[PDB]
Symmetry: D3
Subunit: 259 residues, 6 copies
């Protein structure tokens, strides 16, 4: 019988690998994914939302920048409980979506990154007490997973002892938050999620490219420059606004077409 | 102090024993039951909905067909916890409602069937992977309880080894789902709930009447024909659509009268 | 340029000619019709609603009883203005729907699409003025009628109000009587009158609309032996509905969410 | 046939003549009036709202201060068109409500003031360009009607040439707005509606009592002090906030009771 | 990792120490507090609501009468879990609010009373089975905490064996409910919350002042008359209606200004 | 007294002249503009919506491509009636917004076009439903330069430009309405919506197929659309659906966690 109370926030990194796909992918998301999703998890998900990503910044490609959006669930139970595999109605999820997101080509293909977190950030490392009145945030959400055969403790150490200090040093960076990915849920390859706030694109660039040149290149690096990880495979990211109109449990009133 | 996290889906089988009662019963449900209900359980029920039943099919009477609707709650806690018996405001629930539903007459009445289930089906026995795009479903929801002094294991065996195979054999039947009733909650007499999908009434009839003639009549049978159980006492049912507008936690905006 | 302020209530009489069609028709209505409709007229329709019909009563067939629902719009402008024919996105409205509703017979003769325009308020209040909702639940029998070809409209009117209505007023089982004249100038609808006639329940309806109405003289233009003396689904349609619907679509619709 | 496009804002001044009545009156308003109202005018009213009145200030009684609320409609057509007298369902409006509001006593009662206006203010006389960011407003809405046999032109002149200048002189007064009442609609006795903003009660008092002592007492005065008009008969008023949660066409989800 | 399922109803007693503050405080609550709050706890709070308090009755000051409102949350988890201290965006909560509520004097200064309860009343002591149809309720919600060095068991005994019987004796009192405050959550000084229903203000007065004169004055009393406790410090209260339009999770559509 | 029933659809072409401005402009729109707007016109506007623009396509700059969104109102009355100038509460609309949109730095006009609520001309793709697939909806407005006969401009548009659209299978729809110049003296004359399947289709037709066009004598640039970007032409490409249907959807400026 028993089901465990397991309150979590999940993030899905939705890419769009080509502008010609964007209409079609966006359609599927707002016309199909939403109702199909709510139809299943309404009773045990307290918040379902999409945060469309800002235009990819210079060198965003190197950070596995998701060119469509972040998809964000708040669960009361583990969606990976085997018992939850059974659904009266199943979702309509064509191959094409995987093409559009870049999981498949038509190029090598790219994993589907679905990270589970506690509902609250584990580490507040810069900008505690910042209110919304303090101004609009360029919120750079980035997840990372250390390559195979790299001790996780060492990766952690690198992240917090070498990377974060650079963020703290930069006045252009207004906030730093981190949570450890719950690997015990769906075997997601990622280890950490961070959100790193700037004022704008230029701030992001200055810090995440230029300030990060100062970093020692680690021996396990999969690219020459920070983040030293394979785009879309061991790192994904998006820059998003403070607010989304796509708070789907409250806001969705059907797929009403423009006139 | 402590309250157990106990996520469940419940079903109430609401009959209407006479067309002359229908206006009055429907009024009570939508004018009174909804606000009275929400007023009590809003904070610990994630979904409250009514699925009005399709017109009773031929020989539906023999299946304890609920001629008004299904009432459907999703609980986060056991509503039968004794501590939940205390309410500031109590509901308005007159005798007349029980007359209308057939719990009372005006020479014997019919029990109130209130079945608690896990939030997800335990057994998927036909039609896995069916999406909503596959077409409109005549969803025949049926619950059953084996008569007194009938070994539950034998009843189970009969159901899955004799009844279900007939459902699987019939191309007219698109889906079969089952959960065991949680008897430990409110001593509901029912043992199983199934949902059995057809394309329409004629499909339902063909299978649930005609194909079921082939069944051996068991020694505990309370009627000659399948389902071999006492209508409204050891079997209730309803046929409903895939969709209801009465998703009460989202949709209810008062008892607005037509003009 | 100019567009006329033309506030109206319309009614569409949606039949379902067979129980095997009901799932499919209902699907189309709630999954497709709603979004397609709102997508077009949201800015100039103040209220869009469906009132599902109660189970067809005995001899309801003779009154063109719509076995699915009433569809109800409140317009700010005439939807039949020619300029409103142009739509960026068009609706998905397959033949099959017409089969299901009974406009087409599929593969004798089908049944017209009855789409009646009215003023937003009833023109005639003939019984039960001042009745509140506290007075109890209503079996609301909405019925529209059109007098056959070559029947003087004035005479039809006279018959309706001087012969039919008095029977309704005589019956204690009948709690309310309302009528409006159909706006024929809008979409050439064949109907002339819409009435709503309230009872307590089905039995009341039957007693009055069948039994009390036997007393009526059969008029010379009658298209059937018994009241309403008009061709089912062609010169008369009807539905019995509740006081309340959850399908108030402009407020309530949150997508086609499926049961679990 | 034809119906005139007649876009108007109306105000009803709802008093509560005794604290013992307040529960009962408030109940009727939110439990009964709202649904009954929407049930009638949903299709031709674009906004229906209640603005509960702040606690009656010192000497508010002399201004016909409505101790319950303002009721506010936005019409597309004249509700006094005779054709609109016909309604399928009628409202439940007991005598008691009139007692509670003070239309009836137990030694003389008070008229029901229902004033129709254009949807936009006709005169902006102080504080043009004030935004909501400029701070919270004590919004003193007051309507007045000159006694019988008082030339309307003279009344107008008095109002704008003697009264208003005092408002403009007072720094405590942040805003002044006025519209002429549409007398042609429902024969309302009132001639003008003004809204006069302060920072708070004390500001209101300073200006509307103390500064107004300087006013010449006119020969038609029905009381010694400004506003020189018979409370609740030739003057009503309320002080309200910038925002109400009772925006009934959007917000109402039934009469849900506290737990 | 693990987070405890901890379903609770909390109450905050919001005072307004001066009518000149009321506009400003009300503004902050509805313009700022709501969005700031929802922005944080939407996923783990099932109901967030304000119940504005009726006008302070005679001698209400002696009961720590909250002159603005009750603030009411329903939690799924303890908000005092240390891990919940971390928020991406923090709330805007100026000093001024504390002045307005009376926590600071800008007069002696008064604690912020934030009481956690089970979601259901622990004791039903009068009026069980009362429905909303039985009439409108003057709901007097009162919380109390016994002064320092007063045995809690004795306080309890006094409350239930001496105070409550007076409530039961009075036909003017329609309902009595009580829950023990969860002291283990946020060290709230209060021990009990009761709701005590009347028909109106006069009923309240008759019982809570006049009938309560009959009470023996205990040796620990901090004032001469019942409730024998220090206003706003060891007792707070409010009288509220059965219904509020400020059911914020459902109803809030922005801070829309009147016209 | 009397107010004229004047049902109209308006479009505002909201640019964002720099990515560094985008956070700030977007904030103002969703945090401030919405409530300020609804607070004023709720009773006489039936639909208020934002359609965020797709990423600017190649050579979009030449079409006055609005890099933030389209803003879309449906009015029951003329918002330019002088009597509607009076508001209890006024909007917060700082200079900075005009900088961000590009009205202020040469500087670019504020394009606010009023239309009938229904398209006047349906020139390709009549009867297309939403089931026919997702649309790249290229909304473009144009105004002929000063001293250019309007009749000739019209003729050019419908007899030379549109036929190229009709010829292209990549173009699924063509719609046009004449701008109501009598309302707010908007400089634009026409609004068209022109549908494609995607960006590449748009480009193929609106750049490559349009090379075939004779360059008119009044042209303000060498290539189609032959009009001054952001001044005599603005445009946006948008989706069939927006979540920002503000009268229904807005529940406050709730921040991500
Ligand atoms: O929005 C969603 C979404 C999406 O936007 C893009 C995508 O590529 C996959 C998706 O899948 C999400 C999902 C997660 C967990 C579930 O259990 C589920 O049924 C659906 C869905 O909600
Ligand atoms: O959780 C999952 C999921 C889901 O629950 C719901 C849903 O609507 C889509 C989904 O899509 C995920 C997926 C698809 C393709 C892949 O290649 C892959 O690795 C993962 C799957 O894992
Ligand atoms: O709280 C309750 C309730 C309610 O809140 C609202 C309402 O509209 C009906 C109700 O009735 C429920 C009920 C449960 C079991 C029974 O056997 C029964 O007869 C009634 C009761 O639990
Ligand atoms: O809709 C409802 C309902 C109904 O439709 C019909 C009916 O006969 C009883 C009902 O009672 C339901 C209920 C069950 C358990 C509870 O604990 C409760 O509070 C309410 C109520 O929700
Ligand atoms: O716009 C329309 C429309 C729509 O948008 C959506 C929808 O689901 C059905 C519809 O049906 C209407 C209709 C079609 C054909 C007729 O012959 C007729 O009288 C009415 C049509 O006008
Ligand atoms: O619900 C609706 C409906 C329906 O249920 C059944 C049906 O057979 C036709 C319908 O058509 C309605 C409609 C009428 C006029 C229009 O101009 C329009 O756009 C749509 C639609 O709204
Ligand atoms: O339709 C109306 C109405 C209503 O629909 C609902 C309701 O709750 C109250 C109402 O009261 C209004 C009214 C106006 C003037 C009066 O003098 C009076 O007694 C009542 C009336 O216009
Ligand atoms: O809120 C309302 C209201 C009220 O609060 C108090 C009151 O004393 C009368 C009222 O009557 C309003 C109303 C006015 C004109 C109408 O035509 C109508 O139908 C209703 C109603 O809406
Ligand atoms: O409405 C609210 C509120 C209020 O009205 C008045 C007040 O003086 C403080 C407040 O604070 C409440 C709150 C409690 C716990 C939290 O964790 C939180 O984030 C917010 C807030 O919801
Ligand atoms: O969690 C809390 C909280 C919060 O999260 C958000 C918010 O907007 C207000 C809040 O108010 C509470 C508070 C404020 C000041 C105090 O002096 C005090 O004792 C308590 C605090 O408990
Ligand atoms: O009321 C108005 C308004 C508003 O309420 C809210 C808002 O966010 C912007 C606004 O802007 C409108 C406007 C401003 C400047 C212009 O140059 C122009 O053409 C239009 C103004 O009319
Ligand atoms: O959202 C809107 C909007 C906008 O998004 C961007 C912008 O640059 C100006 C704007 O102004 C719109 C508006 C136009 C005319 C009015 O009279 C009014 O009150 C408001 C407003 O609604
Ligand atoms: Cl700001
Ligand atoms: Cl590299
Ligand atoms: Cl009873
Ligand atoms: Cl389909
Ligand atoms: Cl038995
Ligand atoms: Cl057994
Ligand atoms: Cl039998
Ligand atoms: Cl009743
Ligand atoms: Cl016959
Ligand atoms: Cl709405
Ligand atoms: Cl402020
Ligand atoms: Cl007089
Ligand atoms: Cl006097
Ligand atoms: Cl501060
Ligand atoms: Cl009552
Ligand atoms: Cl103490
Ligand atoms: Cl004392
Ligand atoms: Cl909601
Ligand atoms: K480096």
């Amino acid at each position: 019988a028993d089901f465990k109370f397991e309150p979590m926030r999940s993030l899905i990194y939705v890419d769009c690998v080509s502008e010609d796909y964007r209409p079609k992918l966006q359609r599927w998301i707002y016309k199909v994914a939403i109702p199909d999703s709510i139809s299943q998890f309404e009773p045990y998900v307290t918040k379902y939302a999409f945060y469309p990503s800002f235009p990819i910044p210079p060198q965003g490609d190197r950070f596995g920048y998701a060119r469509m959006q972040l998809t964000e669930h708040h669960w009361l139970v583990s969606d990976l409980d085997p018992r939850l595999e059974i659904k009266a109605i199943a979702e309509t999820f064509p191959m094409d979506v995987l093409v559009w997101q870049g999981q498949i080509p038509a190029a090598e293909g790219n994993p589907f990154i679905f990270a589970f977190l506690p509902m609250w950030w584990e580490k507040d490392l810069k900008g505690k007490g910042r209110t919304i009145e303090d101004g609009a945030n360029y919120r750079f959400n980035m997840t990372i997973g250390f390559p195979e055969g790299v001790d996780k403790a060492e990766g952690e150490k690198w992240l917090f002892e070498k990377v974060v200090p650079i963020l703290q040093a930069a006045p252009e960076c207004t906030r730093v938050l981190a949570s450890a990915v719950k690997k015990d849920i769906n075997g997601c390859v990622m280890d950490w999620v961070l959100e790193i706030w700037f004022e704008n694109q230029s701030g992001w660039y200055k810090v995440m490219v230029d300030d990060m040149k100062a970093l020692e290149k680690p021996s396990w690096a999969q690219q020459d420059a920070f983040p030293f990880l394979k785009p879309y495979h061991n790192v994904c990211s998006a820059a998003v606004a403070d607010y989304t109109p796509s708070n789907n449990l409250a806001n969705y009133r059907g797929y009403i077409t423009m006139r």
